[PDB]
Write a protein that binds this ligand. Structure first.
Ligand SMILES: CC(C)CN(C[C@@H](O)[C@H](Cc1ccccc1)NC(=O)O[C@H]1CO[C@H]2OCC[C@H]21)S(=O)(=O)c1ccc(N)cc1
Lengths: 99, 99
């Protein structure tokens, strides 16, 4: 689809058979989701945002379906103000900015 | 143009005598620029992201040129680590997300 920006670009995602709302975030290198359980091994990591650094759990090769478009990649789980889909996954689903 | 998300979507913006590199950021409601001493009335605000909040100065009706495209609107100014072009000005230069 084409998504305009007068409203937040919130989309429904599917991850582990759960439906969640996430923000398509072109300013985010990484995908960061609110606290949730994901299976498999994870690595402790730290990332920085506008307000400082947080601790996250890094899960690799996680499938997420974003508006029915399939991605498989790295998901960070931790204290984010909102679920955000970053460039790592937006690139996989073919997302570009256009003006 | 079409801006790839393989890399951070940095573009050149102008605000007065200053040329800056700024992210086209769909996850940012409002434009926030690195510390600079703009003229005019402003109001204090706190904006929040990953890591917590920063204090900013909200200036209204500030003209900014984004890759040659004219915009005018709210510009938040404060100790952000990166210059961010938010939705408020992206809409004005015709910017959509597409996949
Ligand atoms: C988290 C969002 C809901 C809001 N953020 C915009 C976001 O695009 C920032 C924009 C951003 C970018 C770099 C540094 C600080 C903020 N990105 C960000 O935190 O991404 C993190 C996840 O991937 C990593 O890559 C970049 C930092 C990490 S925000 O910067 O906090 C923000 C909040 C409010 C406004 N008005 C403007 C910006």
């Amino acid at each position: 689809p084409q998504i305009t920006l007068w409203k937040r670009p919130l989309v429904t995602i599917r991850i582990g058979g759960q439906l969640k709302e996430a923000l398509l975030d072109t300013g985010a290198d990484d995908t960061v989701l609110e606290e949730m359980n994901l299976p498999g091994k994870w690595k402790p990591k730290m990332i920085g945002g506008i307000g400082g650094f947080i601790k996250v759990r890094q899960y690799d090769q996680i499938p997420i379906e974003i508006c029915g478009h399939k991605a498989i990649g790295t998901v960070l789980v931790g204290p984010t103000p909102v679920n955000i889909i970053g460039r790592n996954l937006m690139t996989q689903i073919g997302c570009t900015l256009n003006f």
